[PDB]
Amino acid sequence: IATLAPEPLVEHKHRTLILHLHPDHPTLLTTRSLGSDANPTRQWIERPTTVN
Amino acid sequence: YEHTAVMPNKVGIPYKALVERPGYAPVHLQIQLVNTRIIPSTNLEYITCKYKTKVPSPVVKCCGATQCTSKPHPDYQCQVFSGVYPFMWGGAYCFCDTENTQMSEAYVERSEECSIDHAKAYKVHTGTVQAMVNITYGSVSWRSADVYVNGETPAKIGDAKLIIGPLSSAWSPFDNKVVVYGHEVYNYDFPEYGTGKAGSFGDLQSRTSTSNDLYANTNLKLQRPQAGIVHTPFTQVPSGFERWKKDKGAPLNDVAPFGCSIALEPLRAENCAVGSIPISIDIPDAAFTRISETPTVSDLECKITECTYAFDFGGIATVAYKSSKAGNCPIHSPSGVAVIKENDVTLAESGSFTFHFSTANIHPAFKLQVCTSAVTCKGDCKPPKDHIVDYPAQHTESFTSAISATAWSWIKVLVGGTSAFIVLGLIATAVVALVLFFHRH
């Protein structure tokens, strides 16, 4: 049995997605474009942060 | 009849055409591709897991000295410690002062967790590609079939021959070295058999899950049992699986481009949206119908009633048709400028029906064929006011899509102005070159 971090508060601007994240526990967030270049991004979030 | 085409290797977009064998009504063809299963041929090179160091019982020979052979064992040590006074409960266990033997056999072998978890290392080759496809033609309902993607395979989907020619691009997410762990894979080079680096990945290298040979390489060293207590103190590097888990990279499925997801039991990357696919579908002749039976449609007039270049079908339009007799028509635009939501329209006389469509150009010019006829209609679309949405792109964008027909006017008048100014210069040079040089004479 594993944990679920609270669902990100998500809101949109022009060609950008901005996630307000409030991890209760250290949480892994991965993003990857579906284009030719994956452009991966993988970071652990300890404290509540916003990311674009 | 045989119909050949090409199609975006996209996963939710339907591909719509009309087969036209002359003297018959056009017939509407739909192909939908529901997974893209690129299956690479692989060979398991070796598996690996946490080691476990079994230290058999030491040999304590009291007075005198034994020696021990190199019995064949993974990363085997055996060192005789001379000058031991092992001091147990109820007496010391030997009657000599010094000149006693403590043999210190150590030996390393695969842990039992290797049964349940193991980072098995493969070697990827080119392999084969196949896909599950879904066809819809005429009035026949949906017919689904898996298909090898190579020209040389009939793959009879129902009653029609579908040949899916080799995928336009040969890209694969996997490099030659891949290591599968649990529910994921890694595009990682692996120091292969017997090249184990002694502490990062290949501390253990077992040819198969149950193999009697094991290339341990763990740098086992043995120390003096302190102060005459019986034990075999062994110092050595921690497990390579430990450090590989801690410093594990991003899994391939989280890094694989082209939205490529990965599944495991064939080691296949699904839904891999690269390039295009040729198609050659030989439809039954019986599904066609004589043109002389087909209705005439005439004095077609289509008007766009509201459009907005959204991903989803965000354009509604109306066509006023006049008819010969009740019957069916296919409606698709032969060109990529629009994609029509509606497969078929089954139509009475003398009437005006509505079709939904999706497009990104800001003045679409679809030429849409109702029942082997033609009608062209255009108009303005406006920005659909959402920013990011979750519906993939139904239409394909082309470069000549965003120009707003004033910017088209602007670049036209600019390019005309340059060209005409240069032309005016050229005419002036010619007319001075002759009027003023040759006519004065």
Ligand SMILES: *[C@@H]1O[C@H](CO)[C@@H](O)[C@H](O)[C@H]1NC(C)=O
């Ligand atoms: C983007 O990230 C930067 C740096 O964290 C932050 O200053 C900015 O607020 C973010 N974007 C928006 C729209 O807030």
Ligand SMILES: *[C@@H]1O[C@H](CO)[C@@H](O)[C@H](O)[C@H]1NC(C)=O
């Ligand atoms: C074929 O497409 C139809 C469209 O509704 C869908 O219901 C059906 O599940 C598809 N075939 C398969 C095998 O999924």
